[PDB]
């Protein structure tokens, strides 16, 4: 619960320069996904606060709903709008509606991330937000490891009976990162020069 | 008279539509041509990159 | 620039308001209690009479009207999650009163 | 025979290579077991690299593998267990439970590799399958011993159709079914489990008329591929030895082509057309041929297929498209328009549809329906620019009948309570021919389009006319 | 440390050294090969072992014997930095090319510099004004903002950057850094002459502008580290001195292209179409080395060349991540007789989402975008038939949107000559006012020639006077 209100790099250590993590355990980057037996069908609304989004394409928990559309048309802004709306419920005494969000930023400049975290603190919601970041300056393996340690930080919340949301921005730069290492470790290409075992990473 | 100028006008308008529409046809031919050349090119590179490693 | 009959234009007219109803700007989310009314007005055709340019005037003012008067009604939709016969009739009276804009 | 020890040399991915002894030589297609803290990892030997050095694709995760760690050889193929004790339970790719009823156990085992049957064995469709869904029944009839194939876009109702077939037809018909999930979602496996227990297709105090082998997508690419083979053999045990006419199900077979393409590159094979594996054809041909009717058992496969970005002129669906007798186009648009099924009957090509297979009457009704619909499609251009209001009177009555047919392709579903709100209705073939026959004759030509909305047979159209009146 | 070596090979312009002792240098250390010609500075990129490294060549490899001495400087190529870097032109080896001699310096620094961390961050994003109309309305500059322009030269890539210097650099004051990464030779000489004529730089007086220019007859490894050389100079100003600065970069396609040429040679397998595999890491360093600190603040403007006008090409795509505003200039619009050539539908700024530019400014720009998008939609119908074979409402809409497209042409002021129309400097404050009137039909009643090459509100009126006569 120490990771609440922390920016953390890909290794789960501060870079914003707040105090150290007051953790209750350690976990691993790659652990196998819950089977069909520890599963239970979806049953729990999630609300964006944009009327089209909710009405036409309703979101819920355990679902994976894919926000697709061209780069930088306010793609971060669609994702931030959900995060901001889950504040109303989060604040009170109902546990079924709660948010303890993990925002994932791969390939982006620090300047951009720096605008977001300030927008959240004003809007009163860096209380529960965690930023896993791997900036673009920082190598390809750390960029790649960034979504995946983000997930593990979520499996703990999810396990304990808490609800959270993980934004994976953006998984297209994840393939790209994986491309840099694979082709310089000389592994054959899949399709478009992206190694063919990209699918296994994304699905797990 | 009104009707005759109207059906006549329509004939002219619809003739002028074929001249413009052709020009659009020829443009989309060049678009199809550019597109073909890139698809062939990009496919080669990927096969080559595979042979090379 | 096809010629359009009345049956076709009921659809086109109904649609244009709906499209505008969908319309949103950046950075202004709202809670479920206050999207359930707005959708009733579009789908049950309360905007068909209202002019296309001022759908956006209406969306905002309607919301201020309800906050003063029918704030009891909105709390019920929030707490119970369903609109009853009584909630539906109340919601329908509310849209009506404000259907001039 | 005596176990063969090989020591690991390079773990590169799914690809993991092993270095067996001399004077005792493995063979291609055997199963190596590697002691691990996560079970015993099963390796499909897929190449010999010479001097007894194998390059294998994993059937389970390739994480936390220990360098230089001892590998036993079973001496033979990856062998599952088969029985009637596979009914109910959900198995995986290595023959282990997921639903935790304890080990699937039986008196026989069999391998997941078999060479297809010869020309001599062969046997011909000569039977009628009843679907109980009208668009499908008239306009693209499915017939017993079929190789039916459900091409469509991303989640357009593929799952939705398959769940209804299993609910009705599996229980109705006396033979078995094995529904195979090859690298499907962990959402989808659970929805499928829960749904076939409620409908009574699965009874765990007893015998079932479906089995399940649910594979998972979070398995290495090598493993995703051979989830399909694992399901197939349980049907082969039925087909062959117990001599039962199996109504087979697979989901989604696109996943088998995809799974295979990822390890194709790595095995050292250079890419071919549209980024697909050049071993596209021969791996398809082997899967499809095994699933062919034969004297020992008739097999009636329904295979789901995912069409990539709604482009079917792609080589992988296109290869698959030939082998599949009774193709289905499920258009995305038509799903959205509110018509379930979203079957497009002008682009569904049936090889079981003809002037004798369903007979001259059936063929005729259905030819007249297709043309009428074809007028409506052809006339859209004319309507678009010139307008509807300068269109002929004769064309408009023809178009009014088509429009009535179009919303009569709609029928409700009993597995959709979330997507539809009306319980299913099962419609006989004999009934479909008469009700559509009524429309052309103009008995339905003054009764709304919407009075055929989610109805079953004839009686339902006529009553629903009264419902709109009041 | 001193490390002797001999030049074993010269394969392409990616020389291989074989060192003659067991001491070995680290990766990104710099090495000099002695020839009576001068020197060649090469920089370690791989060790291929057996005491054989492979080194990037920043000088053409002509006339290189096998078994010829190399020497180790013991670190990365060191530029000279200081406040006596001003009035100067710097190449890539830290040597003048404008021949004022040895460049006076206190600290000489390695060209590669580890990027600023995510603890040094200014949250600033305050409006700065361009003085160009199109830009003020659609994508107004910012204190923290990064702007990029894409597409091929239409109006001349360089020339646009010149207007920007003319307007923004005489009203921002203080230091400005220009880094031109493999930029054409002639153009640098014309600019040098202009700054001294316009009394910005003077070599007899003060110099509040500094300069870095490379040359595009230079070898690929060299043109790639022109960018880093400027960037070292920029950081020094931002941090140590703590001054607020600009940056202008033209042409940064050329950085990427230089990298893509060396990528093959080194022993790499590149990405599809041809571009380098290390594109994301490298692009990451530059744009996180221009990242604001809590000392001074900087604003950057970057030019990108596209050899097809396809921004879905892998090199323009990676640029987009590091940009929060763009001002795409398209060749189409230039050819039509509209200068500047800004595309108005491929424009963005971070502050244009909401009332970060004030509510009134947002209403005017929001509607402008809607009108032009309708005009683009009805382009087929217009071509195929016309506008009188459309509905009456639409016909107005089309005509209104035709005045807007034309209206956007603002005459350039250091390129007044080249356009041929005396320049207009149209304020941020004025642009909002002018555009307000025009939307309500207050100037939409007079010719499409009273909108052809005009500035603010006043000029539209004045072009009516002319036409009348």
Terminal C-alpha separation, chain A: 25
Q: CA-to-CA distance for E434 and E365, rounded, in angstroms?
A: 12
Q: CA-to-CA distance for D99 and E37, rounded, in angstroms?
A: 78
**Known catalytic residues of E?**
157, 183-184
State how far the alpha carbon of E116 is from the alpha carbons of A131, D380, E287, in Å.
18, 62, 10
Domain ranges for chain C, please list them.
1-101
Q: CA-to-CA distance for A107 and A170, rounded, in angstroms?
A: 8
| Pick among D337, D382, D383, D389 to test the C interface (most C CBs inside 10 A) | D389
> Other C-beta atoms within 10 Å of D113: how many?
15
State how far the alpha carbon of D395 is from the alpha carbons of D281, D390, D442, in Å.
46, 11, 14
Nearest Cα residue to D324 out of D254, D371, D272? D254
The label of the residue with tokens 């398959």 reads D162
DSSP annotation of D271? P
Q: CA-to-CA distance for D396 and D389, rounded, in angstroms?
A: 10
Angle at E112 between CA E110 and CA E118, to 5 degrees: 120
Q: CA-to-CA distance for E314 and E321, rounded, in angstroms?
A: 12
| D157 in a known ligand binding site | yes
Instruction: Tell whether domain E352-469 is in CATH 1.10.1140.10.
Output: yes
Give CATH for domain D78-352: 3.40.50.300
Spell out the SS3 assignment of D246-258.
ECCEEECCHHHHH
Nearest Cα residue to E91 out of E233, E190, E195, E202? E233
Q: CA-to-CA distance for A36 and D188, rounded, in angstroms?
A: 9
Q: CA-to-CA distance for E243 and E260, rounded, in angstroms?
A: 35
Q: Residue E66 has which token pair?
A: 């096998």
Angle at D180 between CA D176 and CA D184, to 5 degrees: 155
Q: CA-to-CA distance for D324 and D146, rounded, in angstroms?
A: 8
Contact predicate E79/E229, CB 8 Å? yes
Beta pairing, strands E38-47 & E30-35: antiparallel
Query: Count of alpha carbons within 13 Å of D64, Cβ hemisphere only?
Result: 14
Spell out the SS3 assignment of E431-466.
HHHHHHHHHCCCCCCCCCCCCCCCCCHHHHHHHHHH
Contact predicate E320/A108, CB 8 Å? no
List CB contacts of D148: < 8 A, sequence separation 6 or more.
D142, D300, D301, D302, D303, D324, D325, D326, D328
Q: Report chain D's C-alpha Rg in angstroms.
A: 25
| D152 in a known ligand binding site | yes
Q: Residue D87 has which token pair?
A: 């009914």
Q: CA-to-CA distance for D92 and D423, rounded, in angstroms?
A: 33
Longest dimension (CA), chain B: 79
Classify residue E118 as left (phi > 0), alpha (psi -120 to 50) or beta. Answer: alpha
Q: CA-to-CA distance for D433 and D365, rounded, in angstroms?
A: 7
Q: Which range of residues forms the domain containing residue B40?
A: 14-53
Contact predicate D249/D166, CB 8 Å? yes
- Residue ranges of the annotated binding site of A for ATP are 69-76
Q: CA-to-CA distance for E159 and E422, rounded, in angstroms?
A: 16
> Other C-beta atoms within 10 Å of C52: how many?
12
Cis peptide before A97 (omega within 30 of 0): no
| DSSP codes joined into one string, E287-326 | HTSS---SS--EEEEEE---SSS-TTSHHHHHHGGG-S-E
Question: Taking CB atoms and an 8 Å cutoff, what residues of chain E touch C53?
Answer: none
Nearest to C31 among A74, A81, A88 (CB): A88
Please answer yes or no on whether A187 and B53 come within 8 Å at the CB atom.
yes
State how far the alpha carbon of D11 is from the alpha carbons of D40, D301, E108, in Å.
16, 38, 47
State how far the alpha carbon of E222 is from the alpha carbons of D133, E254, E315, in Å.
71, 11, 20
Q: CA-to-CA distance for A129 and A86, rounded, in angstroms?
A: 12
DSSP annotation of D391? S
- Spell out where E154-244 has E strands: 177-180, 210-213
Nearest Cα residue to E181 out of E245, E229, E235? E229
Task: For residue E197, count CB atoms less than 10 angstroms from its CB and return exposed for 0-12, middle for 13-18, buried for 19 or more.
Answer: exposed
Angle at E388 between CA E384 and CA E394, to 5 degrees: 95
Domain ranges for chain D, please list them.
2-77, 78-352, 353-470
Strand partners, D80: D110
Please answer yes or no on whether C3 and D387 come within 8 Å at the CB atom.
yes
CA distance E273 to chain B (A): 6
In the complex, which subunits touch D with 3 or more CB pairs below 8 angstroms?
A, B, C
What is D353-470's CATH topology? Answer: 1.10.1140
Q: What's the CATH code of the domain at A180? A: 3.40.50.300
Q: CA-to-CA distance for C7 and C16, rounded, in angstroms?
A: 15
State how far the alpha carbon of D296 is from the alpha carbons of A187, D82, D117, D160, D170, in Å.
46, 17, 11, 31, 20
CA distance B28 to chain E (A): 13
List CB contacts of E417: < 8 A, sequence separation 6 or more.
none
Q: CA-to-CA distance for E408 and E135, rounded, in angstroms?
A: 10
> Other C-beta atoms within 10 Å of E348: how many?
21
**E1-76: which CATH architecture?**
Beta Barrel (2.40)
Contact predicate D375/D395, CB 8 Å? yes
Q: CA-to-CA distance for E458 and E434, rounded, in angstroms?
A: 9
Q: CA-to-CA distance for E457 and E454, rounded, in angstroms?
A: 8
State how far the alpha carbon of D326 is from the alpha carbons of D116, D150, D175, D352, in Å.
22, 8, 21, 7
Nearest to A197 among D61, D100, D221 (CB): D221
- Spell out where D258-363 has E strands: 301-306, 327-330
Query: Count of alpha carbons within 13 Å of D236, Cβ hemisphere only?
Result: 24
Give CATH for domain D2-77: 2.40.10.170
Q: CA-to-CA distance for D211 and D218, rounded, in angstroms?
A: 22
Q: Which CATH superfamily is domain C1-101 in?
A: ATP synthase alpha/beta chain, C-terminal domain (1.20.150.20)
Q: CA-to-CA distance for E184 and E433, rounded, in angstroms?
A: 40
Q: Residue E159 has which token pair?
A: 């020339």
List CB contacts of E44: < 8 A, sequence separation 6 or more.
E25, E26, E27, E28, E29, E30, E31, E53, E54, E55, E56
Q: CA-to-CA distance for E133 and E140, rounded, in angstroms?
A: 9
Nearest Cα residue to E202 out of E83, E81, E86, E84? E86
Beta pairing, strands E298-303 & E146-149: parallel
Helical ranges in D267-343 per DSSP H? 280-290, 315-323, 332-336
The label of the residue with tokens 């239409």 reads E154
State how far the alpha carbon of C94 is from the alpha carbons of A51, C48, C66, C69, C78, in Å.
20, 16, 8, 10, 17
Nearest Cα residue to D306 out of D158, D140, D182? D158
Nearest Cα residue to D150 out of D309, D413, D331? D331
| DSSP codes joined into one string, chain A | -TTTTEEE-TTS-BSS-PPPP--S----S--PPP-SSS------EE--S-HHHHHHS-EETT--------SSSSHHHHHHHHHHHTHHHHTTT-SSS----EEEEES--HHHHHHHHHHHHHTT-SSS-EEEEE-TTS-HHHHHHHHHHHHHHHHHHHHTT----EEEETHHHHHHHHHHHHHTTT--EEETTEETTHHHHHH-
Count A/D contacts: CB-CB distance under 8 Å: 81
Query: Count of alpha carbons within 13 Å of E12, Cβ hemisphere only?
Result: 14
Q: CA-to-CA distance for D392 and D397, rounded, in angstroms?
A: 9
**Known catalytic residues of D?**
158, 184-185
Q: CA-to-CA distance for D371 and D378, rounded, in angstroms?
A: 10
Residues in chain B: 53
Q: CA-to-CA distance for D409 and D337, rounded, in angstroms?
A: 12
Q: Which range of residues forms the domain containing residue A204?
A: 1-204
CA distance A38 to chain E (A): 38
The domain tally of chain A equals 1
Q: CA-to-CA distance for E103 and E93, rounded, in angstroms?
A: 12
Specify the 3-state DSSP secondary structure of C99: coil
Q: Residue E440 has which token pair?
A: 């309500």
Contact between chain B and chain C (3 or more Cβ pairs less than 8 Å apart)? no
> Other C-beta atoms within 10 Å of E124: how many?
17
Contact predicate D130/D106, CB 8 Å? no
List CB contacts of A201: < 8 A, sequence separation 6 or more.
A174, A178
Beta pairing, strands E342-348 & E107-110: unpaired
State how far the alpha carbon of C96 is from the alpha carbons of C92, D98, E155, E273, in Å.
6, 57, 57, 61
Q: What are E's interface residues with B at a Cβ cutoff of 8 A? A: 269-270, 272-274, 383-385, 389
Give CATH for domain E77-351: 3.40.50.300
Strand partners, C94: none
CA distance E45 to chain A (A): 14
Nearest Cα residue to D333 out of D406, D418, D432? D406
Give CA torsion, residues A169, A174, A175, A178, to 10 deg. Answer: 180
Q: Residue E37 has which token pair?
A: 């010609």
> Other C-beta atoms within 10 Å of E127: how many?
16
Q: Which residues of E199-215 are buried (b: 16+ CB within 10 A; e: fewer)?
A: ebbeeeeebebbbbbbb
| Pick among A200, A203, A204 to test the D interface (most D CBs inside 10 A) | A200
């Amino acid at each position: 619960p120490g990771l609440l209100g922390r920016v953390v790099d890909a290794l789960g250590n501060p870079i914003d320069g707040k105090g150290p993590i007051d953790a209750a355990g350690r976990s691993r980057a790659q652990v196998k996904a819950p089977g069909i037996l520890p599963r239970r069908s979806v049953h729990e609304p999630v609300q964006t606060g944009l009327k089209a989004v909710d009405a036409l394409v309703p979101i819920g928990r355990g679902q994976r709903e894919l926000i697709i559309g061209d780069r930088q048309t306010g793609k971060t802004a669609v994702a931030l709008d959900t995060i901001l709306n889950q504040k109303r419920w989060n604040n009170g005494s109902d546990e079924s509606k709660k948010l303890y969000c993990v925002y994932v930023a791969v390939g982006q400049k620090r300047s951009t991330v720096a605008q977001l975290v300030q927008t959240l603190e004003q809007h009163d919601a860096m209380k529960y937000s965690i930023i896993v970041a791997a900036t673009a300056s920082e190598a390809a393996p750390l960029q790649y490891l960034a979504p995946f340690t983000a997930a593990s930080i979520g499996e703990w919340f999810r396990d304990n009976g808490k609800h959270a949301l993980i934004v994976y921005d953006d998984l297209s730069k994840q393939a790209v990162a994986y491309r840099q290492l694979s082709l310089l470790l000389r592994r054959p290409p899949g399709r478009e020069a992206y190694p063919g075992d990209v699918f296994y990473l994304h699905s797990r | 008279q009104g009707y005759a100028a109207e059906i006549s006008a329509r004939r002219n308008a619809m003739d002028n539509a074929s001249k413009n529409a052709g020009d659009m046809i020829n443009r989309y031919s060049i678009l199809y041509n550019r597109t073909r050349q890139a698809v062939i090119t990009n496919e080669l590179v990927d096969i080559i990159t595979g042979a090379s490693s | 620039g096809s010629d359009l009959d009345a049956s076709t234009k009921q659809t086109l007219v109904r649609g244009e308001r709906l499209t505008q109803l969908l319309k949103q700007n950046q950075y202004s989310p709202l809670a479920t209690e206050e999207q359930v009314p707005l959708i009733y007005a579009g789908v049950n055709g309360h905007l068909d009479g209202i002019e296309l340019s001022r759908i956006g005037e209406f969306e905002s003012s309607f919301l201020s009207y309800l906050k003063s008067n029918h704030n009891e009604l909105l709390t019920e939709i929030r707490e119970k999650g369903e609109l009853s016969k009584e909630l539906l009739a109340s919601l329908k009276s509310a849209t009506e009163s404000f259907v001039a804009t | 025979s005596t176990p063969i020890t090989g020591k690991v040399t390079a773990v590169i991915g799914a690809i993991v290579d092993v270095h067996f002894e001399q004077s005792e030589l493995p063979a291609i297609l055997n199963a190596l077991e590697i002691k691990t803290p996560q079970g015993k990892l099963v390796l499909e030997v897929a190449q010999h690299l010479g001097e007894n050095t194998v390059r294998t694709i994993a059937m389970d995760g390739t994480e936390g593998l220990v360098r230089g760690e001892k590998v036993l050889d079973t001496g033979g193929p990856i062998s599952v267990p088969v029985g009637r004790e596979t009914l109910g339970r959900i198995i995986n790719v290595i023959g282990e439970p997921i639903d935790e009823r304890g080990p699937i156990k039986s008196k026989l085992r069999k391998p997941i590799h078999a060479d297809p049957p010869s020309f001599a064995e062969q046997s011909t469709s000569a039977e009628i399958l009843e679907t109980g869904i009208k668009v499908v029944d008239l306009l693209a009839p499915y017939a017993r011993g079929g190789k039916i194939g459900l091409f469509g876009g991303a989640g357009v109702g593929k799952t939705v159709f398959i769940q209804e077939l299993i609910n009705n037809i599996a229980k109705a018909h006396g033979g078995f079914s094995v529904f195979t999930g090859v690298g499907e979602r962990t959402r989808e496996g659970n929805d499928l489990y829960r749904e076939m227990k409620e409908t009574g297709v699965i009874n765990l105090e007893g015998e079932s008329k479906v089995a399940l082998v649910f594979g998972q997508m979070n398995e290495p690419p090598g493993a995703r591929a051979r989830v399909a083979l694992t399901g197939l053999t349980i049907a082969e045990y039925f087909r062959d030895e117990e001599g039962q006419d199996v109504l087979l199900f697979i989901d989604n077979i696109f996943r088998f082509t995809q799974a295979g393409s990822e390890v194709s590159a790595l095995l050292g094979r250079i890419p071919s057309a549209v980024g697909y594996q050049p071993t596209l054809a021969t791996d398809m041909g082997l899967l499809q041929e095994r699933i062919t009717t034969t004297k020992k058992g008739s097999v009636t496969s329904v295979q789901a297929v995912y069409v990539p970005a709604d482009d079917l002129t792609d080589p992988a669906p296109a290869t698959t498209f030939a082998h599949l007798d009774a193709t289905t186009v499920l258009s995305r648009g038509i799903s959205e328009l509110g018509i379930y099924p979203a079957v497009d009957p002008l682009d569904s090509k049936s090889r079981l549809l003809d002037a004798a297979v369903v007979g001259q009457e059936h063929y005729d009704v259905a030819s007249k329906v297709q043309e009428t619909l074809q007028t409506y499609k052809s006339l859209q251009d004319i309507i678009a620019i010139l307008g509807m209001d300068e269109l002929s009177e004769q064309d408009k009555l023809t178009v009014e009948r088509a429009r009535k047919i179009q919303r009569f392709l709609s029928q409700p579903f009993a597995v959709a309570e979330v997507f539809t709100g009306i319980p299913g209705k099962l419609v006989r073939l004999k009934d479909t021919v008469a009700s559509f026959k009524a429309v052309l004759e103009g008995k339905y030509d003054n009764i709304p389009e919407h009075a055929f909305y989610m109805v079953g047979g004839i009686e339902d159209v006529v009553a629903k006319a009264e419902k709109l009146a009041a």
